[PDB]
RNA sequence: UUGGAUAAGGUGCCUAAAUAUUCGCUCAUGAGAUCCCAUAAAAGGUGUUGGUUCAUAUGAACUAGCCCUGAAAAUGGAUGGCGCUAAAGCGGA
């Protein structure tokens, strides 16, 4: 019982993400950059992966 | 369109930054073979250095300086950003600010510092005297309060 | 390195501002935030007779720009707060289980209780002066609030941490309590 | 006059020409500015310059005059651009750099300190190719451009620098960097 | 350091620095109170700085750690032992100066009544740029088990009041002097007088 | 042997000599620190510092400085130590 409004914000806070393709680190969706030190910060951003 | 009294307020805002290097702002020399010597900032030149000029009352030439070696004083004297040192020597005269400075707590300290420095040995003991005297009056007046 | 650099913050109406050596302090209708900057080097200047606060930075790199914005954002948060408190909007989501959300404590405290049915008891203290609402209007949320935007914020923050499920696929369990919105009174 | 300031960067004119040769009884001379350390440095550099551009070596050419340029205004503030060539320890660059100064070699003296500073750029890596006065009209450096502003004013945050006399390790109370 | 004995305030100093003036100095030959070694600083971060003691404190003899790196954290202990560091403790005259310096936690029976010195070369306001990230000692030795911290603060509060009291009685005394002194400039000779304000006084 | 004045090297303390002056750069949640020398790379970095080439005060692309990642081994631990960040680091003068 997840109406459709609610489900869309708890999707814009667990999912609608990006992921470092090194590190696994959760970013914002708009990301260009890890923000983790251990990867030195690459470039290389995929989107969380959906269903 | 004037302020009327706004132009109060304006003069008694307590800025934290007052003395800004800047044309004719007066200048205590700190570090060099000029040192203890006043010369005025007449041009900037970079954010670090500074064309200083003792108008030739003082001792320092024309000449550019490392704005660490500065010490700002509380005195200015409005100067067109060209003046060359014939100028600025007329303007100080005018004005007077030689004789502001020197009346200003850490010019006279300075003039007396001078003073004690160049004092003779029996000078020093004429000081010692008076101050023995004034202890001897001084005494006497506390033992009267007590 | 910039010779000056500046940002000016206008005053609201009814708002007591007192800076000093960057301790600044703004009081008003709800509440009396005092908030220290002393770590950047910053003139804030006041005028009282105008309305408005300078901040200006002499020299420094767009490092000290930056700070400066910062500074200056945080002021005019605190202006906000003062005038009109911040209103964090959380509503709740299940799937399942309802969330019991249980206010006590003069409504700081939120006891959370029946997150994905585990028949104990989630606590999540409010910080400094900073009120715990439920709903007037809807059914689910819940409303935290008390001029401090920061210090609302991490007490919404708090609360989210306190509910969200741990080892499951998060996709998945969408269960929680989200802020909704942020707003004002 | 102040010796612990001094950067001794002066500008030497170099005219010198290639032996004259039965073949070739007329050469041609060759001039340069050289901004040196001293008179003798600036020649060398004039040699090497000639080596790198003409077939002329110090043994076969023969300096015609080294003169030494001083600053005609050097009190008056002027806004010097530089182009630069310099090795980095991978390649070869050119660059463009420009400095606030009070004559040519001040500037050159300034930026020497930058190269090096800045990209670790040492005094051999690097060739000044020109040197000109820019009109406030065409100065494309911003932390110039902020010079050149009109009533030009800002404080002193500056530490001081006190007389050695004067520093003195045991102090009696808690001196202020703010001073005022 | 012609003195007896230097007490320094050693508040807002930069650890090293301050170490470093201290060490020359017992070298020389002169006694020195460091004294208030909770509020020493250090140029670091924190959370680097205890990184760093901790690394530190790993360091032990493997077999047997009753000897070995001894781990001595009051903030006081850390400012003697840096400043053991830079003495060649190992001979006699290192050893004699090492001894000469006494370090103190707050402060207590005479070096609340003797002028507290500050080393100005070493101060955290005139060595560190203000966007630079520093530590107060005290804390630091907090967060790697001290714990004598709190009361610490307490004593310097109770101690601040007693100076303040202390601190108007003089400006009081001081103020009387001056008016002892306005009165009896008028009543010496004239001469003398005039001699005396030439001289400043 | 006495005195002088240097060399290499240094000049925060250990350590005799600069907490010298002067211009930059650099903050490192395992900084760096001087020939032989006692290790580090490819590859990255919307870290900051300069540039260069382009386009319409923003957007690109590069480029090389320092810094970061890459960087994991066994007794405890080594720029020689302390420590240093308006350097006592790196590059100059
Ligand atoms: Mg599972
Ligand atoms: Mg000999
Ligand atoms: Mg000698
Ligand atoms: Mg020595
Ligand atoms: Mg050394």
């Known amino acids: ?51 | 369109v004037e302020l009327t009294e706004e132009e109060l307020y304006i003069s008694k805002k307590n800025l934290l930054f007052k003395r800004f290097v800047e044309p004719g702002r007066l200048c205590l020399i700190e570090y060099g073979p000029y040192a203890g010597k006043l010369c005025f900032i007449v041009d900037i030149v970079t954010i670090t250095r500074v064309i200083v000029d003792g108008a030739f009352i003082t001792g320092v030439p024309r000449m550019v300086i490392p704005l660490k070696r500065l010490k700002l004083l509380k005195e200015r004297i409005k100067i067109n950003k060209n003046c060359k040192s014939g100028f600025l020597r007329k303007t100080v005269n005018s004005t007077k600010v030689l004789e502001e400075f020197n009346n200003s707590k850490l010019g006279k300290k300075m003039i007396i510092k001078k003073k004690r420095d160049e004092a003779t040995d029996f000078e020093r003991f004429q000081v010692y005297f008076a101050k023995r005297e004034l202890k001897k009056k001084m005494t006497t007046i506390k033992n009267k309060k007590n | 390195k910039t010779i000056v650099s500046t940002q000016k913050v206008l005053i609201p109406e009814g708002v007591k501002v007192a800076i000093n050596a960057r301790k600044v302090t703004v009081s008003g209708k709800y509440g009396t935030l005092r908030r220290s900057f002393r770590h950047l080097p910053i003139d804030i200047r006041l005028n009282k007779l105008k309305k408005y606060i300078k901040v200006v930075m002499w020299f420094g790199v767009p490092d000290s720009l930056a700070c400066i914005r910062t500074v200056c954002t945080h002021l005019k948060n605190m202006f906000t707060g003062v005038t009109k408190k911040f209103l964090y909007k959380m509503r709740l989501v299940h799937a399942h289980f309802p969330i019991n959300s249980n206010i006590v404590d003069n409504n700081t405290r939120i006891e959370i209780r029946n997150y994905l049915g585990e028949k104990s008891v989630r606590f999540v203290k409010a910080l400094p002066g900073v009120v715990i609402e439920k709903s007037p209007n809807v059914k689910d949320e819940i409303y935290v609030s008390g001029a401090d935007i920061e210090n609302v914020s991490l007490t919404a923050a708090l609360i989210h941490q306190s509910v969200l499920c741990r080892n499951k696929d998060i996709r998945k369990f969408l269960d929680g309590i989200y802020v909704s919105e942020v707003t004002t009174v | 006059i102040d010796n612990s300031l001094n950067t001794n960067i002066h500008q030497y004119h170099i005219v010198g020409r290639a032996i004259p040769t039965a073949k070739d009884k007329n050469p041609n001379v060759y001039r340069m500015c050289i901004f040196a350390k001293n008179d003798t440095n600036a020649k060398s550099r004039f040699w090497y310059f000639m080596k790198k551009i003409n077939k002329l070596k110090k043994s076969n050419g023969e300096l015609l005059a080294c003169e030494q340029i001083k600053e005609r205004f050097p009190l008056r503030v002027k806004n010097y651009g530089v182009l630069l060539r310099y090795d980095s320890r991978t390649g070869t660059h050119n660059m463009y750099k420009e400095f606030r100064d009070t004559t040519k070699e001040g500037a050159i003296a300034q930026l020497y300190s930058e190269m090096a500073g800045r990209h670790r750029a040492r005094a051999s890596s690097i060739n000044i190719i020109r040197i000109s006065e820019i009109s406030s009209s065409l100065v494309r450096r911003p932390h110039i451009k902020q010079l050149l502003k009109r009533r030009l004013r800002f404080p002193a945050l500056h530490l001081p620098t006190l007389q050695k006399e004067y520093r003195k390790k045991f102090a009696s109370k808690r001196p202020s960097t703010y001073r005022m | 350091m012609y003195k007896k004995e230097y007490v320094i305030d050693c508040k807002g100093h930069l650890l090293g620095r301050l170490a470093s003036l201290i060490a020359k100095e017992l070298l020389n030959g002169q006694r020195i109170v460091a004294v208030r070694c909770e509020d020493i600083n250090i140029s670091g971060s924190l959370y680097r700085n205890k990184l760093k003691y901790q690394e530190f404190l790993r360091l032990r003899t493997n077999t047997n750690p009753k000897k070995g790196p001894l781990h001595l954290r009051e903030p006081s202990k850390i400012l003697w032992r840096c400043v053991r560091g830079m003495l060649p403790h190992k001979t006699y005259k290192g050893q004699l100066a090492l001894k000469k310096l006494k370090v103190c936690v707050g402060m207590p029976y005479p070096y609340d009544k003797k002028k507290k010195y500050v080393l100005p070369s070493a101060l955290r306001a005139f060595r560190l740029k203000k966007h630079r990230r520093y530590c107060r000692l005290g804390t630091l030795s907090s967060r790697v088990g001290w714990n004598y911290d709190t009361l610490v603060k307490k004593n310097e509060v109770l101690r601040k009041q007693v100076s303040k009291a202390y601190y108007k009685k003089k400006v009081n005394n001081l103020n009387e002097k001056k008016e002892i002194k306005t009165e009896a400039l008028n009543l010496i000779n004239p001469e003398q007088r005039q001699v005396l304000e030439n001289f400043g006084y």
């Open chain 1, 1 to 51: 019982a997840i109406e459709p409004s609610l489900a869309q914000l708890a999707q814009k806070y667990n999912c609608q993400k990006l992921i470092c393709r090194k590190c696994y680190a959760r970013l914002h969706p708009r990301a260009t950059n890890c923000r983790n030190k251990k990867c030195g910060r690459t470039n290389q951003l995929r989107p969380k992966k959906k269903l």
